[PDB]
Amino acid sequence: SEACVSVTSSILSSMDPTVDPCHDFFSYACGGWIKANPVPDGHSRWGTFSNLWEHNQAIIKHLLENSTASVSEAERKAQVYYRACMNETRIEELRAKPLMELIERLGGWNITGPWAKDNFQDTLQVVTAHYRTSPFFSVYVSADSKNSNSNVIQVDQSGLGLPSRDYYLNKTENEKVLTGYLNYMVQLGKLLGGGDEEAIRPQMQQILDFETALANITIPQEKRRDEELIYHKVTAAELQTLAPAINWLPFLNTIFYPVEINESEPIVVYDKEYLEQISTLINTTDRCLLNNYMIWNLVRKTSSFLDQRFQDADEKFMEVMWKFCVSDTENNLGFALGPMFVKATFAEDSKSIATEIILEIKKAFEESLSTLKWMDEETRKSAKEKADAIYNMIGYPNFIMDPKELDKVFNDYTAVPDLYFENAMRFFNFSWRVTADQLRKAPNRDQWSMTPPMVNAYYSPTKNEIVFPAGILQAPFYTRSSPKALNFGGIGVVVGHELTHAFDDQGREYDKDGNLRPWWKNSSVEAFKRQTECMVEQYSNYSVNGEPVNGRHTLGENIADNGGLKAAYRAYQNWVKKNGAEHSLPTLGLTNNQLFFLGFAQVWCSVRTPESSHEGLITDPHSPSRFRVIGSLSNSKEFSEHFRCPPGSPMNPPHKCEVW
Numbered sequence: 216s217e218a219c220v221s222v223t224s225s226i227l228s229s230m231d232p233t234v235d236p237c238h239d240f241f242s243y244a245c246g247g248w249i250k251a252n253p254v255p256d257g258h259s260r261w262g263t264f265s266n267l268w269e270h271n272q273a274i275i276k277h278l279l280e281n282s283t284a285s286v287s288e289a290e291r292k293a294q295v296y297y298r299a300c301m302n303e304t305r306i307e308e309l310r311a312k313p314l315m316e317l318i319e320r321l322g323g324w325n326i327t328g329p330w331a332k333d334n335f336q337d338t339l340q341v342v343t344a345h346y347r348t349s350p351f352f353s354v355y356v357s358a359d360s361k362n363s364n365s366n367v368i369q370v371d372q373s374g375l376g377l378p379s380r381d382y383y384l385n386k387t388e389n390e391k392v393l394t395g396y397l398n399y400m401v402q403l404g405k406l407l408g409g410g411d412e413e414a415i416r417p418q419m420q421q422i423l424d425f426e427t428a429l430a431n432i433t434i435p436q437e438k439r440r441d442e443e444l445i446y447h448k449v450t451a452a453e454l455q456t457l458a459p460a461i462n463w464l465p466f467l468n469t470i471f472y473p474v475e476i477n478e479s480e481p482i483v484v485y486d487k488e489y490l491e492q493i494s495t496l497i498n499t500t501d502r503c504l505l506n507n508y509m510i511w512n513l514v515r516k517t518s519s520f521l522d523q524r525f526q527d528a529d530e531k532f533m534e535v536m537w538k539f540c541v542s543d544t545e546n547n548l549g550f551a552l553g554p555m556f557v558k559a560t561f562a563e564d565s566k567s568i569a570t571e572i573i574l575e576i577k578k579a580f581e582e583s584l585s586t587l588k589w590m591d592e593e594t595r596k597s598a599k600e601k602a603d604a605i606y607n608m609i610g611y612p613n614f615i616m617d618p619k620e621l622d623k624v625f626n627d628y629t630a631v632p633d634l635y636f637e638n639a640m641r642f643f644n645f646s647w648r649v650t651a652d653q654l655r656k657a658p659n660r661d662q663w664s665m666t667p668p669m670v671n672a673y674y675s676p677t678k679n680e681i682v683f684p685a686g687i688l689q690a691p692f693y694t695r696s697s698p699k700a701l702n703f704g705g706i707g708v709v710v711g712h713e714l715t716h717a718f719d720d721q722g723r724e725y726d727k728d729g730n731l732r733p734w735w736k737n738s739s740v741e742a743f744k745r746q747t748e749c750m751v752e753q754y755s756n757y758s759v760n761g762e763p764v765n766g767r768h769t770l771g772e773n774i775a776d777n778g779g780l781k782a783a784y785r786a787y788q789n790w791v792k793k794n795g796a797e798h799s800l801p802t803l804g805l806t807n808n809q810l811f812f813l814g815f816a817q818v819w820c821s822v823r824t825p826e827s828s829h830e831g832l833i834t835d836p837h838s839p840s841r842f843r844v845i846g847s848l849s850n851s852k853e854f855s856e857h858f859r860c861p862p863g864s865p866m867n868p869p870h871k872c873e874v875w
């Protein structure tokens with residue numbers, strides 16, 4: 216009651232009743248929230264996810280600041296990692312020395328002072344395996360897309376100190392984040408013993424030039440959607456002809472030690488011409504520059520762990536782009552904190568209920584699969600079969616709630632009191648070794664690419680698995696006292712979204728066992744592609760601040776938004792079918808079935824930086840929040856019936872798209 220009444224108030228707070236739902240439902244649902252909530256100090260884009268993440272951080276402080284020392288090695292190591300970084304009386308006493316020292320062990324750089332050595336693949340090997348850096352290219356170990364029960368070596372593009380290749384390329388002419396990034400380079404060049412700006416500026420400029428070629432050679436993420444077409448497996452002998460600049464067998468044999476690599480090693484390469492282009496770019500440029508580039512990468516990875524002269528540098532630039540290390544600790548040692556996190560935040564009740572809600576969403580999804588007009592029955596049968604085989608994890612991975620197993624995983628990491636920078640580096644080397652050690656092991660589903668306190672969720676095509684961290688199994692997504700309409704509208708939609716990823720323009724290319732391999736007739740694939748073109752056409756109709764929204768670019772996450780809204784509503788109808796209507800909320804003027812659509816929209820209430828929107832509109836595969844709402848609701852007949860949106864109001868398009 217008082218919980219219904221508080222929840223009603225916050226619903227009502229957020230809306231803008233001056234706006235008509237059938238005109239713009241997002242404005243109607245969030246216009247109040249938008250206008251009230253301004254983008255705060257430390258943030259450039261704010262909303263539900265921003266909000267809940269920060270609630271969690273604050274919980275992580277009290278967990279980490281224990282007195283009783285009544286926790287496991289792994290948990291104890293996070294406490295140590297935390298204290299170590301929080302002791303900043305110590306960090307101001309060390310200054311640049313830690314990093315400024317590390318460099319010379321590596322052989323120094325022309326910023327201090329002269330530099331001339333034959334040490335290239337050596338320092339390349341070190342920074343990649345010891346400091347978890349990725350200049351030139353990124354190397355790692357994950358499931359073989361075409362043989363999901365194995366891991367393989369993977370070489371991909373990397374090495375840009377900006378978030379996206381287009382900041383190097385567009386911005387030259389459209390606002391100079393280049394000025395702001397050279398600055399930042401220059402000042403860090405000072406902090407690490409570079410003296411005269413006339414001496415730093417040029418050096419640091421050449422790194423910028425090289426970093427832009429990296430970006431020139433780099434491949435636009437539109438030419439990197441479709442895995443079938445960019446997956447290229449080569450032998451290590453084929454890689455050596457392809458990119459002769461690196462001596463690969465020695466290189467691989469050193470970073471994948473203790474595993475032996477011979478000429479027949481399989482290596483998945485996502486762009487052959489890139490790697491060719493890297494090699495030529497490596498063999499063509501002078502070595503000091505090659506060295507200076509490599510160290511710069513090292514400094515970008517590492518500067519966060521030095522003093523408040525650097526933080527200032529990082530802060531300043533991010534205004535152009537001390538909870539601080541509760542983040543860092545979660546980032547690196549998040550599975551270390553998980554047990555603490557879920558003891559505090561996660562009723563085990565919650566797991567059981569979340570498990571029933573998942574069953575119910577699958578059920579509904581499958582009932583849509585059975586009924587889909589664009590597939591023949593044979594294709595519908597294969598799809599159900601892959602649906603049936605989707606594996607789910609809730610809250611946490613099992614192994615973390617067994618201290619014997621969690622301590623084993625973290626046994627080779629050692630955290631030292633008061634040595635934050637050494638602690639970090641030690642972690643980087645440890646983290647690299649965990650990935651390297653997977654090369655000859657089987658992938659399994661109990662291994663997550665997200666820690667439990669994260670406010671997010673995902674699907675893996677190679678494990679055919681949907682994952683929900685305990686961190687998102689929170690309000691507004693889930694609350695066990697909350698009306699079902701609101702639970703099916705929050706978490707229920709998040710679930711359907713993940714299920715639907717099993718079948719999107721990417722996930723459909725992988726079969727039920729997680730393998731990239733045709734498992735439909737081409738005819739059904741041609742038929743799938745036609746449904747999807749509707750959502751391309753649809754979402755390219757949207758614009759933001761006088762600029763289009765990209766319908767091809769956002770297709771996958773739109774397909775998942777649409778399948779999941781729809782599965783969640785059906786599931787909620789299923790629940791009402793079995794159980795009967797719950798009561799209605801009071802101040803609201805709204806039934807439960809309307810509440811469903813409203814709750815959904817209020818999850819996506821958000822504000823963001825005017826620059827961010829021009830940018831997300833090219834980098835984010837997710838649609839802008841408002842068109843996530845509007846694009847989804849607009850394909851729902853059931854949304855329109857329930858808000859009685861006339862025959863061709865904005866929110867009620869006659870060209871409705873439907874794939875899943």
Ligand SMILES: CC(C)C[C@H](NP(=O)(O)O[C@@H]1O[C@@H](C)[C@H](O)[C@@H](O)[C@H]1O)C(=O)N[C@@H](Cc1c[nH]c2ccccc12)C(=O)O
Pocket residue numbers: 264265670671672673674687709712713716772836837
């Ligand atoms: C439906 C939502 C609860 C979770 C949903 N996860 P999903 O899109 O399946 O997958 C996400 O996006 C993919 C492109 C990435 O490759 C994944 O690893 C993951 O980040 C999502 O849209 N996430 C967005 C929005 C978001 C959720 N939690 C966040 C926390 C911080 C920032 C953004 C988010 C994102 O991660 O970008």
Ligand SMILES: OCCCCC(CCO)CCCCO
Pocket residue numbers: 550614624646649650653661662
């Ligand atoms: O049950 C197997 C768990 C093994 C845990 C590691 C596997 C990585 O794929 C990750 C742990 C985090 C190290 O940074």
Ligand SMILES: [Zn+2]
Pocket residue numbers: 712716772775
């Ligand atoms: Zn998604």
